[PDB]
Write a protein that binds this ligand. Structure first.
Ligand SMILES: [Ca+2]
Length: 600
């Protein structure tokens, strides 16, 4: 393989030899593209883009396109030299910190010619806390009631007193409520507060308010037995009061931080990073002209943003997929093929990802690290054939770790079966193995470690998942027993524990929709969390086949106890030998294999 070198001290006018390296991946890919176009002999055995140890900051995604395609004998591989660490960062450094009491304050610089805002902030590789009302979520306040007709949320007056002035009017201009509702959270930006004696009338901004109040599922819990929806409050100067909290004042363009033990903001050995762009690598072809035979190896991807919740709120249906329109229907819709009557209509959007792959084949990630991210880690979006995601770490991710396939096209109501005529559209034959997921969904608690929607021939095996807010692995979509594109899906020998940290209606492995000849086998699930603010404390499981699930063999899974749910399933699922009696050999070989345990 011929080599093209990049360095943090390189220059894009250089020829890309090791003594004279490029400065950017964009320039280095362009040179590789030119070698392939002109049949340069250095292409013969592949092209390896070798990157010197360091951080490479991006102001726009790297666009890997059909003309970048390798072949099986001549792949393009992008990797560090030796065992040096390479970070592709979508963030920028904040300096010029001045002391102002217990807090420090800094001007937020311009990014790509405009004011920058952000929802995450990292200090020496350690995520800081966007300022909120309570530290311990077990201490969240609960709501009092919902007025749907008027779009009002009533909560205890004591909960919001720090956000109002002497006259009971909202004083925290951009304050946000994060509302726990059944199996999702919603991000709802506060427009106004009106004190109503012991209660406070909370109104929210558009566009989220309309969608929040009219969508039926999930919806806020208002109960007589102490299970009302919890919420917390964030994004307000008035809530910044403990070490590690920050608030960014967008009107002043200043950011305030309460430093933690050993953080020395005026020293150069202390790095404050904020995220600036959504997507670092965009692998994108067309269905006729796919991108192919690209491998990323040992690359760290970091510091991506996603500002949609700050701009439009965030009212997801499930798995972090936000509703663009969602309402109750009466009478219910009657459906074909023995489907249960449907009481709602929903259309969805897809969160941004650090790395996206669409219209491609044989796009591999080997021992990459997805670390410090504001939305999704890795997203195999559409029309991808194959690809091996193996040995990767996913950690400190606000949303889903790894996303594959369709959650219904934007215009396609999300309970109607998805089965496109153009079969090229459907993600098929992905292999996701020996990856470790921890501390994902750490903002959007409705998110998963591995979220595969409408896919076919997927193989999810020997992964380990822990410390996640909700389910571990979710496979399928559509809430329908109508036979569709899905078939041949496998979830095998994964290890899932310390899940459902925040959300119930949950399992270690969860399925939706009809999936001919699919398999959930030899997994190991244990040690579920028991949070105090969940909607119903018994509504948790180790393994859970949800509406439509059909033709799935659920067999030989070691689980801590027998606690399973089959809700509104279709036919032909086989449940056999699941539980604590499963052979020890199966129990113990679940998760990372010996070769990849250095991920921990
Ligand atoms: Ca606080």
């Amino acid at each position: 393989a011929g080599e093209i070198w990049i360095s943090p001290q390189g220059n894009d006018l250089n020829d890309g030899t090791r003594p004279s390296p490029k400065a950017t991946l964009t320039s280095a890919l362009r040179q590789a593209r030119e070698w392939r176009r002109t049949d340069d002999e250095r292409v013969r055995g592949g092209i390896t883009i070798c990157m010197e140890g360091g951080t490479y900051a991006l102001y726009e995604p790297v666009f890997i396109r059909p003309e970048d395609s390798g072949t099986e004998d001549s792949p393009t591989v992008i990797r560090p030299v030796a065992d040096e660490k390479v970070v592709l960062s979508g963030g920028i450094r904040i300096g010029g910190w001045k002391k102002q009491g217990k807090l420090w304050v800094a001007d937020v610089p311009m990014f790509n010619g405009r004011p920058l805002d952000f929802r995450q902030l990292w200090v020496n590789g350690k995520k800081a806390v966007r300022a909120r009302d309570v530290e311990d979520f077990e201490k969240m306040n609960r709501i009092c009631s919902v007025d749907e007709k008027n779009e009002i949320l009533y909560v205890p007056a004591v909960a919001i007193r720090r956000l109002v002035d002497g006259k009971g009017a909202l004083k925290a201009k951009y304050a946000e409520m994060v509302l726990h509702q059944m199996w999702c959270v919603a991000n709802l930006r506060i427009r106004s507060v009106e004190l109503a004696g012991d209660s406070a009338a909370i109104r929210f901004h558009q566009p989220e308010s309309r969608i929040q109040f009219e969508h039926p599922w999930p919806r806020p819990m208002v109960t007589t037995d102490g299970h009302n929806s919890a919420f917390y409050l964030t994004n307000a100067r008035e809530l910044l009061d403990v070490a590690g909290e920050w608030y960014h004042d967008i009107d002043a363009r200043k950011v305030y931080y309460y430093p933690r033990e050993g953080e020395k903001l005026q020293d150069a050995g202390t790095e404050v990073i904020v995220p600036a762009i959504e997507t670092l690598i965009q692998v994108k072809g067309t269905f006729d002209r796919p991108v192919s035979h690209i491998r990323f190896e040992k690359i760290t991807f970091s510091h991506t943003t996603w500002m949609r919740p700050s701009e439009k709120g965030h009212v997801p249906l499930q798995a972090g997929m936000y509703l663009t329109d969602g309402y109750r229907i009466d009478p219910k819709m009657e459906r074909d093929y023995l489907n249960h009557p449907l009481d709602n209509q929903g259309w969805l959007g897809r969160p941004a990802a650090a790395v996206s792959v669409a219209a491609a084949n044989q796009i591999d990630f080997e021992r990459c690290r997805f670390d410090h991210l504001g939305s999704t880690g890795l997203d195999y979006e559409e029309a991808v054939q194959g690809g091996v995601v193996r040995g990767c770490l996913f950690r400190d991710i606000a949303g889903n770790g790894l996303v594959v396939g369709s959650f219904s096209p934007a215009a396609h109501e999300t309970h109607l079966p998805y089965d496109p005529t153009d079969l090229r559209e459907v993600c098929a034959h992905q292999q996701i193995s020996n990856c470790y997921f921890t501390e994902v969904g750490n903002e959007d608690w409705g998110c998963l470690a591995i979220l595969a929607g409408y896919v076919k021939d997927i193989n999810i095996e020997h992964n380990e998942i822990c410390e996640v807010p909700y389910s571990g692995i979710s496979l399928g979509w559509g809430w329908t027993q109508t036979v569709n594109c899905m078939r041949n899906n496998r979830v095998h020998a994964n290890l899932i524990h310390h899940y459902a940290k925040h959300m119930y209606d949950v399992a270690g492995v969860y399925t939706l929709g009809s999936q001919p000849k699919s398999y959930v086998t030899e997994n190991c699930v244990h040690s579920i969390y028991k949070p105090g603010y969940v909607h119903d404390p018994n509504h948790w499981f180790y393994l859970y086949t949800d509406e439509g699930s059909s033709f799935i063999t659920v067999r030989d899974n070691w689980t801590e106890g027998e606690k399973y749910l089959q809700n509104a399933n279709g036919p032909g699922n086989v449940w056999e030998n699941n539980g604590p009696q499963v052979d020890t050999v199966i129990r113990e070989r679940a998760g990372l294999e010996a070769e990849y345990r250095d991920l921990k």
